[PDB]
Each structure stands twice: as structure tokens, then as C-alpha cells.
Design an enzyme around this catalytic site. Structure first.
Site, PDB file in Angstrom:
ATOM      1  N   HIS B  46      29.170   9.606 -17.782  1.00 58.93           N
ATOM      2  CA  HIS B  46      29.876   8.734 -16.839  1.00 58.93           C
ATOM      3  C   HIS B  46      30.840   7.728 -17.456  1.00 58.93           C
ATOM      4  CE1 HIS B  46      25.995   9.904 -14.937  1.00 58.93           C
ATOM      5  NE2 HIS B  46      26.794  10.165 -13.917  1.00 58.93           N
ATOM      6  N   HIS B  48      31.913   4.081 -17.140  1.00 58.96           N
ATOM      7  CA  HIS B  48      31.458   2.820 -16.568  1.00 58.96           C
ATOM      8  C   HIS B  48      32.597   1.809 -16.469  1.00 58.96           C
ATOM      9  CE1 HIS B  48      27.020   3.658 -16.538  1.00 58.96           C
ATOM     10  NE2 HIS B  48      27.474   4.658 -17.273  1.00 58.96           N
ATOM     11  N   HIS B  63      28.712   2.525 -12.955  1.00 55.66           N
ATOM     12  CA  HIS B  63      29.679   3.602 -12.874  1.00 55.66           C
ATOM     13  C   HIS B  63      30.983   3.002 -12.395  1.00 55.66           C
ATOM     14  CE1 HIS B  63      26.056   6.440 -12.069  1.00 55.66           C
ATOM     15  NE2 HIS B  63      26.264   6.288 -13.365  1.00 55.66           N
ATOM     16  N   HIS B  71      27.054   7.520  -5.237  1.00 53.18           N
ATOM     17  CA  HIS B  71      27.006   8.394  -6.397  1.00 53.18           C
ATOM     18  C   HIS B  71      27.002   9.866  -5.993  1.00 53.18           C
ATOM     19  CE1 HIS B  71      26.313   9.653 -10.491  1.00 53.18           C
ATOM     20  NE2 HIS B  71      25.315  10.408 -10.068  1.00 53.18           N
ATOM     21  N   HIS B  80      31.521   8.681  -7.246  1.00 55.41           N
ATOM     22  CA  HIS B  80      32.206   7.629  -7.978  1.00 55.41           C
ATOM     23  C   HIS B  80      33.367   8.237  -8.742  1.00 55.41           C
ATOM     24  CE1 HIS B  80      27.969   5.665  -8.122  1.00 55.41           C
ATOM     25  NE2 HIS B  80      28.598   5.327  -7.011  1.00 55.41           N
ATOM     26  N   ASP B  83      31.916   9.567 -12.066  1.00 59.73           N
ATOM     27  CA  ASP B  83      30.860  10.569 -12.184  1.00 59.73           C
ATOM     28  C   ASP B  83      31.463  11.868 -12.688  1.00 59.73           C
ATOM     29  OD1 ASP B  83      29.030   8.713 -11.007  1.00 59.73           O
ATOM     30  OD2 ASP B  83      29.451   9.499  -9.005  1.00 59.73           O
ATOM     31  N   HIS B 120      24.301   9.713 -21.114  1.00 59.83           N
ATOM     32  CA  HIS B 120      22.986   9.167 -20.805  1.00 59.83           C
ATOM     33  C   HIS B 120      21.848   9.997 -21.399  1.00 59.83           C
ATOM     34  CE1 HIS B 120      24.256   6.041 -17.780  1.00 59.83           C
ATOM     35  NE2 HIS B 120      25.327   6.812 -17.760  1.00 59.83           N
ATOM     36  N   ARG B 143      21.178   4.562 -21.938  1.00 58.87           N
ATOM     37  CA  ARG B 143      22.494   4.975 -22.412  1.00 58.87           C
ATOM     38  C   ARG B 143      22.458   5.235 -23.925  1.00 58.87           C
ATOM     39  NH1 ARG B 143      26.009   0.518 -18.835  1.00 58.87           N
ATOM     40  NH2 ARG B 143      25.035   1.263 -16.888  1.00 58.87           N
TER      41      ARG B 143
END
Lengths: 153, 153
Positions: B46, B48, B63, B71, B80, B83, B120, B143
Site C-alpha cells: 500500500h 500510505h 492508506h 478499503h 483507496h 490499495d 505489510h 509494516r
């Protein structure tokens, strides 16, 4: 009312965090932070062209200069957009940065987001070292630490 | 014809380099690189909100979603902006990334320069996970590594 940040890191003990804030569009950018791990004295402090850090600070490219001006100091008219001059490390290897430039920008023509901030080994002659190089990098020497300038909250 | 790059790094063995290229304005962004140090399997992948890395990957924020949507997966209308779904580590802990998203952008409305890319610990349920958290972060977990997305040559 945009803000940015940069975490400087290098092979050496050099490391730090630098902050960018530009309250108004086109307005000045306030630059402030602290850096430790520097020899006491003056160090070249420049925004290089690329946020490329794949080969360390090496891969950052040249001074950021949309303008193809020669090198120079912050207050010089003939200067790179990214020549922020020099920073000063006290007797305890700590440079405490408080700058305010109006050439750089967090938005628009001279946007510096996505680019790399570099603190150099030695000082930046601002173009007065009497050789071609002085008119290129202001003879700053090896790059001690860097970081991509990212968007802060 | 803009290009970007990102060096992912974390406390763990996780590390990698990811590339962004967007040949045309508004066009799709081709995303490709390699990541090693990942458990074999699927990992949430993702963009962020902030290029803030002062507190590590933690400080990257949520995100990236200019949209204020729920999401989801890259192939969903409801997702998002950041994503990018999941990436796949082979039996040798190596995820080889080749993605092509049209929601993200290297310029304009959904510009992702100056922002942080995060891979992640576990997989991204794509919202199909059974609980509110599933539809906040697809339950990706800690993360493992990150990097500010910078401008490449």
C-alpha cells in the site's frame, strides 16, 4: 499551507531530521531541523535532482537546478534552486538548522518534494574557490547523509 | 513521461527497490521491482499518506486515499487510491513485482510522489475479511519495510 519532511541518513554517524513548511503558495519555505554526527564546522547543504537512493546518496544526482544557473550561495542571484548554502556544526558535532529560502518551493515551479536533501563533508565555497568545481558543486566533497524529501502531515 | 522510484527498508531482513513509470499524463502507472526478506506468500502492498519516516514506517500514516472511500482491492471501484492489493513472495522469500494501476498517478490529482510505499507482514483480505478492520486496512498487520516515493531520472 503545505509541509514536508526529510530523514537524513548515511554510512557514517551522520543522521538527522529536517522540516519544511510553506504557509503560502509561492511564499518562502521555512527549513529547520537538527543534524548530528558532523565534524564541527560548515557543511554544504543542497537539494539534488532525484529522489533516487538506490545507490545511496550517490544516486541523488546533481544540484537541483531547473534553471541552468551556475552554482552560488543562497543569497546569490546566480545560483542553483537547490543551493541552500551551508550548515554549521557546533563543538558537539550538532548542526542546528534554521533557514528560510524563497527559491525552493513545496509546490509549483521549484517543487522539491520527491527529491533528495544532502549534507556534504566539507563547506560550500559558494563559487569562490577559484576553480571550475567551485562553480559546480562549490567544492563540497563526499556526501555524508541524505534522504528523500517526503510529504509531512 | 514521468518516472519515480522507492527504496523499501525496515528493521527486518525485508528490503527492496520499486520502480514507477507513467508514460502519459493521466495514463496508467507501471509498477515493478523486487523485494526480498519476506515470508513466502502474500503481503499487503500500500501507498500510505505521508512521506514521513521519522518514526519509521509507523509515521507513514493511513492508506493514501484522497477519496475517503472504503478499503478494497486494486480491481474494485470502491477502494483507496493507495490499495495496490498484494505482492507474492516465492519459496525464496522474493516477491517479484509487476503491477499496472490506473488510480494512482505520478502527476495530478492522485500524485503519489512524496509519499510512502509500504509492504505489510500479512495479506490484504481485500475488504472480504469479515470485520470492520478488514475494511479499514484489509488486516495487513505490521509494516515490514517502507520508503518515500521519490522522483527518478
Amino acid at each position: 499551507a503545505t509541509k514536508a519532511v526529510c530523514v537524513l541518513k548515511g554510512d557514517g554517524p551522520v543522521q538527522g531530521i529536517i522540516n519544511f513548511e510553506q504557509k503560502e503558495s509561492n511564499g518562502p519555505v521555512k527549513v529547520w531541523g537538527s543534524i548530528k554526527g558532523l565534524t564541527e564546522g560548515l557543511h554544504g547543504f543542497h537539494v539534488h535532482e532525484f529522489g533516487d537512493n538506490t545507490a545511496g546518496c550517490t544516486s541523488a544526482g546533481p544540484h537541483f537546478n531547473p534553471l541552468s544557473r551556475k552554482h552560488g550561495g543562497p543569497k546569490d542571484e546566480e545560483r542553483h534552486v537547490g543551493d541552500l548554502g551551508n550548515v554549521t556544526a557546533d563543538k558537539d558535532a550538532v548542526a542546528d538548522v534554521s533557514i528560510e529560502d524563497s527559491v525552493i518551493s513545496l509546490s509549483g515551479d521549484h517543487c522539491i518534494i520527491g527529491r533528495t536533501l544532502v549534507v556534504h563533508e566539507k563547506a560550500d565555497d559558494l563559487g569562490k574557490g577559484g576553480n571550475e568545481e567551485s562553480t559546480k558543486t562549490g567544492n563540497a566533497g563526499s556526501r555524508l547523509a541524505c534522504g528523500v524529501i517526503g510529504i509531512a502531515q
